[PDB]
Design an enzyme around this catalytic site. Sequence first.
Site, PDB file in Angstrom:
ATOM      1  N   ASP A  55       0.815  -1.210   0.000  1.00 25.32           N
ATOM      2  CA  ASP A  55       0.000   0.000   0.000  1.00 25.32           C
ATOM      3  C   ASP A  55       0.850   1.263   0.000  1.00 25.32           C
ATOM      4  O   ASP A  55       0.598   2.187  -0.778  1.00 25.32           O
ATOM      5  CB  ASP A  55      -0.938   0.031   1.198  1.00 25.32           C
ATOM      6  N   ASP A  58       4.637   0.571   4.019  1.00 26.82           N
ATOM      7  CA  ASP A  58       4.415  -0.654   4.764  1.00 26.82           C
ATOM      8  C   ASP A  58       4.268  -1.808   3.780  1.00 26.82           C
ATOM      9  O   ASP A  58       4.546  -1.667   2.583  1.00 26.82           O
ATOM     10  CB  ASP A  58       3.175  -0.494   5.647  1.00 26.82           C
ATOM     11  N   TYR A 207      -8.037   1.904   6.610  1.00 32.36           N
ATOM     12  CA  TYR A 207      -8.800   2.306   5.429  1.00 32.36           C
ATOM     13  C   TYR A 207     -10.284   2.063   5.688  1.00 32.36           C
ATOM     14  O   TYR A 207     -10.969   1.330   4.974  1.00 32.36           O
ATOM     15  CB  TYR A 207      -8.307   1.580   4.181  1.00 32.36           C
ATOM     16  N   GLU A 424       4.779  10.691   4.085  1.00 35.03           N
ATOM     17  CA  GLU A 424       4.087   9.465   3.691  1.00 35.03           C
ATOM     18  C   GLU A 424       4.047   9.340   2.167  1.00 35.03           C
ATOM     19  O   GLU A 424       3.958  10.338   1.445  1.00 35.03           O
ATOM     20  CB  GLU A 424       2.659   9.441   4.258  1.00 35.03           C
TER      21      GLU A 424
END
Length: 615
Positions: A55, A58, A207, A424
Amino acid sequence: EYPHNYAELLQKSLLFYEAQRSGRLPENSRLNWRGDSGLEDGKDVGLDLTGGWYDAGDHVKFGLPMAYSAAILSWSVYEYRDAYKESGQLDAALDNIKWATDYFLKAHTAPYELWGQVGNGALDHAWWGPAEVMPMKRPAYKIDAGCPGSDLAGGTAAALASASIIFKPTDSSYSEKLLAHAKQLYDFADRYRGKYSDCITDAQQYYNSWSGYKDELTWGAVWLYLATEEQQYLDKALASVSDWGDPANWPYRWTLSWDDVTYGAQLLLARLTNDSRFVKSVERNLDYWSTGYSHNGSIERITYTPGGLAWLEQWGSLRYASNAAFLAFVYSDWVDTEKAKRYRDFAVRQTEYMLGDNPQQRSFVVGYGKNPPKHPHHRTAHGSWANQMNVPENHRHTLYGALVGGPGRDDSYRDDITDYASNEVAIDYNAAFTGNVAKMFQLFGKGHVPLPDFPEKETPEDEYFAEASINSSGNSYTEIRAQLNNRSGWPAKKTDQLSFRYYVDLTEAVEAGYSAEDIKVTAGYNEGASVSELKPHDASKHIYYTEVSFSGVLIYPGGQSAHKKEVQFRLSAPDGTSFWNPENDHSYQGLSHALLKTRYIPVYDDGRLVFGHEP
Ligand SMILES: [Ca+2]
Ligand SMILES: [Ca+2]
Ligand SMILES: [Cl-]
Ligand code: NA
């Protein structure tokens, strides 16, 4: 200034998706620092669930944003195929989308069963290291008829249906297979209603289906219409909109995202129908994002940073502005009104902000442009051997093409691996962005060509090695302390058959009347190695070695204890003898009483020399 090249930028954005690949990688892979990983994905449920994309920074494979990302990537190839072709990136765009859709086909094992997650959020995120050497269990989770997920199933149906369109020219049978699975997944979404995160409950913490599934039901249906041109799917799409409620109350203050695809669905339906419901809602949203939405009596407008970024919220700020810019681009290529010009200008300005035209005077795309982010929040690109975010202090690998979360509402920003708001990265971040880059190439990219032979293979640092020191030495023995390291990263690799050799010269033994049989090799403190008696290396020069083997001991770059194993060993001439002389011994050279890496204790993996020098 930075001389922008949108063919290069598009090439790099697609290379980001290549860096996200899970599973067994093809031999011709462009990234030498990525290796096989997640090879047991699905084994706990008796299925091959390997492949797909990680994703973010990670290694969870989260189904809802993965479907979304594949759908939007396919959407931009659908809208801007010529731009992909002329920039040289069409083959790469299709190949990268196919990596995702191939995984969706594996995850869609039965008509009303869809594997929606591999990896557990807490188990995966608790560990900081490269994908290839993940040490934790990776459970698989599914939705099915008894525990459904219309959002996940609808979004995956949309991804397969959009992909079926763009694959038809070059691979009609694969296209037909994608389409047949999309019809099944949509029937699953339609007939068995529920939010997927109520069934794959782990997903609630990462999510969560905040918006519900009414948007994905429309999204999947309209994509199936575009892919089949059968009226039933347009009818279904339009019928599904009745569950959106009063059109005057349709949301307009958010934007397209992995969670809420309302904005994509209504845009597609507006082009197909010119129904004022969808036109007005699309324009409410893009007015609010660009010049301001007029209530007749007041102007309502999203927050802008002083530097000009349309700023939705703290996390993935650039992703949200990029998602809005993509809607703006697609709408401005359709509509004939003044809003087309205003939205186009908005989309360009937002894209130019994230490419460097901002108060930080820097690109927010890793490996592209002026002073790009050096420390994206990404485990495998960083390459820690020590389960620590600050070791090494700089990334081992360049995560080309990744769009970072970016600045805060005051344009502030920090290039820090721990700054999640700033740095991120994620597949949903790059999905619409990739389309925006394609459009920038179409608009401004005449004469832009991609980079040849790119990227260059990274030269590895030392990956396997012994650090060693002298415990004691006498006129009849040498005793060594050794720590055998696996700090691999090009690619990181698990090793359970590592060994090393310590070489001696026995000339002084032979001259004194002794032989290799008279030297005893013994282990002291020992974390699982065997130490052999002396074996000949060069019989004419009396060169021998002891083989020290950690066979069966897992050593890997995943923690302070994980990446090394220790053994202390002694080579002893008979007690009372005085001939022993370490100073002519190959592996003794340069050793001190402090543990230090040495090139003269060569290291082997499964019998293959991987570091250092033999005599
Ligand atoms: Ca939704
Ligand atoms: Ca010697
Ligand atoms: Cl450890
Ligand atoms: Na750096």
